[PDB]
Structure 1
Amino acid sequence: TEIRVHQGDLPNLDNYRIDAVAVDTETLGLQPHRDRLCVVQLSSGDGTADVIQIAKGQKSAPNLVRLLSDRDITKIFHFGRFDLAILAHTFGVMPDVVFCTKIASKLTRTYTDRHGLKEICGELLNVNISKQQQSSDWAAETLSRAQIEYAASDVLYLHRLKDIFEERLKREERESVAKACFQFLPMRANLDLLGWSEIDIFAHS
């Protein structure tokens, strides 16, 4: 696979005049206020991916942010609740046209309790994703080849998954449910940033 590695931002949007872009992030941890965004991955759904290393203290990435803001382009995530939070905290823009394969999995793969990306890719595409056998310092000045391949591998399959999940949501007549969930997901992320990350706001207690 071809993986293009960039510093700071995309050079241009020539490769992203499309209807949907797959998006993922890597960080130093699960807490956006402590653990900075380190790498952002994008894919057009073809056999290539873009991996953008983000510098410490970087507040802007103009081309990427133009992609994130374009209402005409659906951003595909796996568990977008986190990626939306860290992206909004880092660059100040919250995407509002999104698709999340984890919510879709919870709405369609009702015969299992395993909704991780590895299990989804294995079941839906017969593609074997190999997951890192160790964690690493994503803030390293120079990423290893294994890191680059793993980061690109996290976005290469989201288009095919979205297509399959759209077929399943149509078959079982749950399209409007998913649509409402996706509409609320950015605000769920905002609730996380504001301090309710450990609270199910809709629960009785």
Structure 2
Amino acid sequence: ATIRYHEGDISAEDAARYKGAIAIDTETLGLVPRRDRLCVVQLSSGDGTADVIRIAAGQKQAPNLVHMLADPARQKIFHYGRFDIAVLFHTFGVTTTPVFCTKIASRLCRTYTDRHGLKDNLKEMLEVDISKAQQSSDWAAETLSPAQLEYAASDVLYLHALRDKLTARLIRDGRIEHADACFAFLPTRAKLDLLGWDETDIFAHS
């Protein structure tokens, strides 16, 4: 199938499709990790297909997903990893590593625009169109709608391609090393957020 569903954790069979980079996004009940639980983890290996894993209330374990997230041999790709890395660390205790963030890379090379959302990035870098629902969706439902399923999958289907396009810009425009040091600090940035520094830049004076 185009989208592969899992309850609680990705199957070993489908975890084995990921031999390189893993594209990933989550869905939650909101933007405060300590208040709003993790509901969905969506993955893609780059081949046009997704794994959508439904996370249950109170579930603190996903052994196969956690293994992938922890695996230093496979890069995990987010658009704004700062948040999802924090969600995964709060829920599972796992420090996702290493990571590539297409929003940080966008801010570092697409210096001519202020539009750094994923939709704007995919339209310019790949000519792909994606749509935003309406902001208001209960991702903790019993049964996710099929709309809910394709929204989640479209968040990870293109991150491989987008990473490649942006990587060539960073190298062309000379800031690939800046992006990589940003990627290495990112899990720390996410843990400071969980600790309450989420609205301050630690590198400022205040």
Partner of 1:79: 80
SS of residue paired to 1:166 = helix
- C-alpha separation between the residues in 2 aligned to 1:203 and 1:21? 33
- Deviation of 1:15 (Å): 1.4
- C-alpha separation between the residues in 2 aligned to 1:52 and 1:88? 17
Partner of 2:11: 11
Aligned residues: percent identity?
Answer: 69
Matches within 5 A, 1:40-189: 40-189=41-190
The answer to whether structure 1 residue 202 and structure 2 residue 190 are counterparts is no
- Deviation of 1:66 (Å): 0.6
- Deviation of 1:133 (Å): 3.0
SS of residue paired to 1:76 = strand
Q: 1:179 to 1:139 in 2, by over 3 A?
A: same
Q: Please give the per-residue CA displacement for 1:33-68, whole angstroms capped at 9, x wherever unaligned.
A: 000000000000011100000000001000000100
- Deviation of 1:11 (Å): 1.3
User: One-letter code of the match for 1:6?
Assistant: H
SS of residue paired to 1:89 = helix
List runs of 5+ in structure 2 lacking aligned partners: none
Per mean C-alpha deviation after superposition, the further-off stretch among 181-190 and 127-136 is 127-136
- C-alpha separation between the residues in 2 aligned to 1:199 and 1:38? 27
- Deviation of 1:134 (Å): 4.8
Task: Give the total of aligned pairs.
Answer: 204
User: One-letter code of the match for 1:5?
Assistant: Y
Q: Which runs of 4+ in 1 moved over 4 A?
A: none
List runs of 5+ in structure 1 lacking aligned partners: none
User: One-letter code of the match for 1:32?
Assistant: P
Q: 1:93 to 1:134 in 2, by over 3 A?
A: closer
TM-score of the superposed pair, with normalisation by structure 2:
0.97
